[PDB]
Each structure stands twice: as structure tokens, then as C-alpha cells.
């Protein structure tokens, strides 16, 4: 699609067989999902936002579906208020900013 | 232009003949720039996302030249770690997310 930006660019994603709403976020280096359980080994990481930091669980090589695109990548899980699809996965679905 | 997302989508902006780098951020409702003087009246606003909030000042009718496009709109000023062009101005320059 060509998604306009008058509203938040929210899409449907699927991970671990759970469907979630997530924000297409060119301002995020990484993909950060709200607190949830995921099987697998993980590493702790700290990420930064506009006014603070949150600790996340980094899972690697996770299959995740974004707006119908089956991709594989790193997902961070932690106390974000909104599920965020960041550049690590936006690049896999071929997403560009056009103006 | 069409901007891929392998790197952070940083572009040059001009505001009152001042040269500034800023991040094209589809995950931000609003535009927020690091501390600077801007003309006109303002009101305090809280903004946040990942982690805690920061207090900023809201100025209106501020022209910004973004990657060649002169636009005019609301600009928040405050202790953001990164200059951020949010949807309020992205829409004004005709920006979409395409895949």
C-alpha cells in the first residue's frame, strides 16, 4: 500500500500466533512489542526513547508477519505502550518514505 | 524523494536560516526540536513514548524547509535527544509510507 500519515500508521501483525496492532515507525531502529510471553532464549537490552529508557527482552530470528509479509528478525519485548514496527523489519517488507 | 530505511531517515531542515538535522518519524504525532529560540507565543505540553515524558514548549505557524519543501505548522521545543519531524509536518510535505 501507500499509507498516508493523517492517522497513525497502524497495521496488523502476527507473532507466536497472536494478532496485534502495531505502529509503522521510521523513528525506531528496532521492533518493540508490548509485554507478552515468547518461547526462546533472550538477552536483556536497554533502549532509549524521547524522554527515557526501557529494559527489553531481545529475541532473535523470530518469525513475524506484518501486513501479510512473512519476515524473520529480532523482536524486543518490554513495556512500550504501543507495539512498534521499526526499521529492522520495515526494510524487510520494502517500506520506503516517499514525498 | 524516496527514502529507504537501512539507515535512520535523517534529513537537513532549515528554520529561520538555521541549519539542523532531523529524523523523519512516522511514529511521532508531533514535531519536536531541541532547545532553540522561536518567535511567537507558546504553551507547555507533555510528550512521551518509549519510557517517561518530557515537558516541551508549543509554537505555531513555524516555517520549516524540509528536504526542499517549505511547510508551516506546529513545532514543539524541548530537551529531545533527537530532532524529530512528526506526522503533523510529514503530511504537509505529502509524505507516505510505501511498500
Amino acid at each position: 500500500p501507500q499509507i498516508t500519515l493523517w492517522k497513525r500508521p497502524l497495521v496488523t501483525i502476527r507473532i507466536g500466533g497472536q494478532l496485534k496492532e502495531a505502529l509503522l515507525n521510521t523513528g525506531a531502529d528496532d521492533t518493540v512489542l508490548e509485554e507478552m510471553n515468547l518461547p526462546g532464549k533472550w538477552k536483556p537490552k536497554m533502549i532509549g526513547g524521547v524522554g527515557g529508557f526501557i529494559k527489553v527482552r531481545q529475541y532473535d530470528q523470530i518469525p513475524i508477519e506484518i501486513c501479510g509479509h512473512k519476515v524473520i528478525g529480532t523482536v524486543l519485548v518490554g513495556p512500550t505502550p504501543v507495539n512498534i514496527i521499526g526499521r529492522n523489519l520495515l526494510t524487510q517488507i520494502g517500506c520506503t518514505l516517499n514525498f | 524523494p524516496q527514502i529507504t530505511l537501512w539507515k535512520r531517515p535523517l534529513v537537513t531542515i532549515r528554520i529561520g536560516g538555521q541549519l539542523k538535522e532531523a529524523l523523519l518519524n512516522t511514529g511521532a504525532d508531533d514535531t519536536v526540536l531541541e532547545e532553540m529560540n522561536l518567535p511567537g507565543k507558546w504553551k507547555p505540553k507533555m510528550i512521551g513514548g518509549v519510557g517517561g515524558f518530557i515537558k516541551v514548549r508549543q509554537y505555531d505557524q513555524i516555517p520549516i524547509e524540509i528536504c526542499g519543501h517549505k511547510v508551516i505548522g506546529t513545532v514543539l521545543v524541548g530537551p529531545t535527544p533527537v530532532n524529530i519531524i512528526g506526522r503533523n509536518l510529514l503530511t504537509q510535505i505529502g509524505c507516505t509510507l510505501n511498500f
Binding site: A28, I47, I84 | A28, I47
Partner: peptide, 10 residues
Amino acid sequence: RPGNFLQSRL
């Protein structure tokens, strides 16, 4: 109300 989701790797 959270509205700016800048996120950066460290």
C-alpha cells in the same frame, strides 16, 4: 498520552 515513539538502540 504517549505520542512520540522515537526509539533508539544503545
